[PDB]
Design a protein around this nucleic acid. Structure first.
Length: 76
RNA sequence: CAUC
C-alpha cells in the first residue's frame, strides 16, 4: 500500500509464469525487487507478464514481506 | 506471492 518510490526503471531478472512471480533489478539502486503477476499492468499484445531482460517502469511499495513492484509497465 |  505505501508508496516508496515512483517511476523507477529496472530490468526483469526473471519472471516465472507458472509461479506467477519474479524479480526486477532496480536501475537506480541495483537491488532486486519482488514482482507478483497482479502488479503488472494489462498487456496490449499471459495478460499479466513481463519478460526476462526487459526494461520496465514501476512503483516501489511496501508489501508484507518487503519492497515490491507496483504498476509495472513499459518504460514511458 | 520472495530466487523459480
Amino acid at each position: 500500500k505505501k508508496v516508496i518510490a515512483t517511476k523507477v526503471l529496472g530490468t526483469v531478472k526473471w519472471f516465472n509464469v507458472r509461479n506467477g512471480y519474479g524479480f526486477i533489478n532496480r536501475n537506480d539502486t541495483k537491488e532486486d525487487v519482488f514482482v507478483h503477476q497482479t502488479a503488472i499492468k494489462k498487456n496490449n499484445p499471459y495478460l499479466r507478464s513481463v519478460g526476462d531482460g526487459e526494461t520496465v517502469e514501476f512503483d516501489v511499495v511496501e508489501g508484507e514481506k518487503g519492497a515490491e513492484a507496483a504498476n509495472v509497465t513499459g518504460p514511458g
